[PDB]
Design a protein around this ligand. Structure first.
Ligand SMILES: CNC(=O)N1CCc2c(c(N3CCCc4cc(-c5cnn(C)c5)c(C(F)F)cc43)nn2C2CCOCC2)C1
Length: 114
């Protein structure tokens, strides 16, 4: 079972676009967290493997995923980083839970199709 890069891009990119369409919830996820710019210099002490929407998009566009689960792993790494770093009462944390709900809804029919 081998997946062509364009097969993964066509199937999976719409699920990433579904996340981008969430406003305001996708806004903290669209670019790599910049700890110095944001004034949160502890970020990289807590989050060892950053991930965000732009990076996943680039990996999809440049054929970095060989299997659907590798893309799913990156989306979930993004979510887990956000729940790990941010407090449960914070915007980023609540927004992460919304994106996880949206992603779950969108990814399962795509997985059934792949
Ligand atoms: C997954 N992202 C993640 O873990 N981050 C770490 C914490 C963080 C992020 C942002 N950014 C990044 C830039 C864009 C952005 C936009 C919004 C936003 C939401 N709606 N609108 C209209 C704008 C929000 C907001 F949700 F907090 C946060 C952020 N700030 N911080 C805090 C906010 C309190 O000060 C200290 C820094 C990312």
């Amino acid at each position: 079972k081998i997946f062509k890069p364009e097969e993964l891009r066509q199937a999976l990119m719409p699920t990433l676009e579904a996340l981008y369409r969430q406003d305001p919830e996708s806004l903290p996820f669209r670019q790599p967290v910049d700890p110095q710019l944001l004034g949160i210099p502890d970020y990289f002490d807590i989050v060892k493997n950053p991930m965000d929407l732009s990076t996943i998009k680039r990996k999809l566009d440049t054929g970095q995923y060989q299997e659907p689960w590798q893309y799913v792993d990156d989306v979930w790494l993004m979510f887990n980083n956000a729940w790990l770093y941010n407090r449960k009462t914070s915007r980023v944390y609540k927004f992460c839970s919304k994106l996880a709900e949206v992603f779950e809804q969108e990814i399962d029919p795509v997985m059934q199709s792949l």
